[PDB]
Amino acid sequence: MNILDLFLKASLLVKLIMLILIGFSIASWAIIIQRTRILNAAAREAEAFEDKFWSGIELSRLYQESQGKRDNLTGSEQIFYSGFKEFVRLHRANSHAPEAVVEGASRAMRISMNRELENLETHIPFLGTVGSISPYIGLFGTVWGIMHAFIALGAVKQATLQMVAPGIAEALIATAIGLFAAIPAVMAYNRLNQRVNKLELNYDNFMEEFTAILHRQAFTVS
Amino acid sequence: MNILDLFLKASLLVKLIMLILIGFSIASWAIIIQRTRILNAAAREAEAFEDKFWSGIELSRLYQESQGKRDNLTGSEQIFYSGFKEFVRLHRANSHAPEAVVEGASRAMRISMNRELENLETHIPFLGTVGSISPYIGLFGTVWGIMHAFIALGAVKQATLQMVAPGIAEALIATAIGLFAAIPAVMAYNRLNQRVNKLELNYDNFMEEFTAILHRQAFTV
Amino acid sequence: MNILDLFLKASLLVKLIMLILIGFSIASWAIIIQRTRILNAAAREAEAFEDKFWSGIELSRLYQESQGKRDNLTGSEQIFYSGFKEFVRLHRANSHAPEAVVEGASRAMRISMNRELENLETHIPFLGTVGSISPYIGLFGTVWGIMHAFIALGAVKQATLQMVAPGIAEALIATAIGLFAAIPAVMAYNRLNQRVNKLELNYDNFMEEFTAILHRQAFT
Amino acid sequence: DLFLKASLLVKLIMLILIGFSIASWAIIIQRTRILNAAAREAEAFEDKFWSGIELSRLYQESQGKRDNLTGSEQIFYSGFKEFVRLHRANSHAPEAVVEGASRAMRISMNRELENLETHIPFLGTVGSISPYIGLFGTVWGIMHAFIALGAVKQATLQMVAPGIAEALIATAIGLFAAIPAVMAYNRLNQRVNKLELNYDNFMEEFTAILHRQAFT
């Protein structure tokens, strides 16, 4: 009679598909709400550190200011701190060859930058999974509903399509909620990967700027 | 069998759509076999040259072996032969800076690497289009069959199965053959495309190795 | 049954949608046959020019050989002619520092690469519109056709499938033609963009590798 | 009329799609006016920069129009301003001064591109979503049909007709919102990619003349 009493009357399999697709719609909107706020903060923190790095302060003075927050460092500041720590270690160790010091510092930046990005993208592959399987989970609920309707239609002698209207109705609701769970997750997976690639490009561009600073400093002094 | 007469009696549009999709199915299988044969040979032959090059043989000895094979060259050997021939040509022709012979060799390697990857990824782009649009060509034939079913149900004050079945059978067959022509391309395309990118990374690493060797050689003079 | 009999009786809007989708089919097939011929010529010409240019012939000879046919020049040969012509102009008429003539030649190459490359991608973005809007324009023609049918049917006291089905069959034509105009444009736009990107990559590598020779020639 | 008699959910679905239609047209018109201005402005500045007039004169021009500085002028002014700032401070080597100046170009060039594209991502959502909002509208129309048709001895096309009407109208408006948006999104996005390459091209050639100015 109404969608509430239809869902209460529906087969246990349609109830289970409903709970799975609601569960993925809950989880994917929670991941979107968390990750969009994480990437807003990380993109702003990168721009807000890099302006300071380019303010004309000495890198030694910037590093001393950063040492006081070692337990809290993130983004382009954590990339800078990892680079400068291994530079000031390797440079002093032997009064060493500048190419070997600067390579070691650039590698210390790279490993710290990849280690930072897996903290930014942590749940994004789940959105790509939810967006991929939710059409199929809805469609499985649809096909199972149509099967149960056509088996019941085979049992009664005065068979007519009027006998299967509620069986097709729950089967159509199961695909409709399948695409509802899929669409936000597929659009957000594509959008959040574009944001992470834009932010990875910004970190990569900062490692080149800082590598040039270290290469010019090392070849001046060593 | 009567099945051929039923096919001849189908709508002209469905006869064209069946020739297109059966043509795509046959072409898709011919490509999947031919590219699997070629990429097996290219992957094995490249590996069997990398060890030869890294065996500690002197590169001039390896090059004068390769001069005996000059029509059969492919993969990492064609990249090597192109790089070494240009390196020797430039380093022999005049007193050039060592960066100039290293750049010239690096270019001759780029050109032959790209030209060999075109010999590997020849019909893979087409296989990708078959896997993409084959179900939508089936869908177009399905809508044509549905239209021929409705125009029959509209014709007489009581319809019958013999009148509507031509439109239904055209629509079901166009759905089935649209999927049957997609399936081989959908499984093979991503697999073959990853195998081409596997060899691209092999050749790019061989270029980086051989470029460093030629640079280290040129700066001895 | 015959398509013209259904076309002549149809509403003005679905009849106009047929002329749009047939017009897109007519134009997209012309653009595909024209573009694929142009990209075949460009690919074979660029491949033949890399084999000529790197053969070891002196750039003085290769320039005056190129200059003999300047009116019908294209591809990597246009990029070379534009670069070397400006290099000669600056290094002979003004004799500035090596980097100042080489960046001037590099700018002249960058202009001619963009000008040659947009001559390859002249009508390709039209196929990108046809392949994306054509099925929706078809579906809008079908949805309008089904509504129209029901508007004509709704005056009947007790309806039946026999009287609405001819209107549904007339309306599905716009979906069928909306797909027929789309398939060939989809196949071509995705493929022609790969072929143009492959040529863009070829011209861009030629610019860098030739710029290194102009840089070294001017420095010496 | 139908919109007055239709269910409350269908009123919201039709108002959302009419809203996406009028908003996507307003964005398509406005972005076209902006990108026409930005393309004409850029090519008019490139001919000024390569005129052979010295860069200090173009900086004095830019100092006068500092307020309406957009596009290649706003990239040029930011780069040359930072170059003069660091070079007149004289605290660093010339190869370091132009590296800081080239960053002040790249920041300003991002700041321009993020101002050109400002509503284009929304058309990407409108062209992707309007079909599925139509699909939801038709599923709610089909619900109004099946809840009646499953609850009678024998159905008729007469009793389901308002469910078909609400469904087909919601699809028709869904397509009408989708077509302009999916058409214009790829057109506008390709014009932004053309300006991105044009500004990136300028930024490198301007960085190169600054590198020679700094060593001079």
Binding site: - | - | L179, N193 | T138, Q154, A178
Partner: peptide, 26 residues
């Protein structure tokens, strides 16, 4: 960039045609 065929609104047409057969009540 890619461009695939988009036909999502065809579900809306099929669901209406499916309902029309359901409503015939033979």
């Amino acid at each position: 960039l890619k461009s695939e065929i988009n036909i999502v609104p065809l579900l809306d047409v099929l669901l209406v045609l499916l309902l029309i057969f359901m409503a015939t009540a033979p």
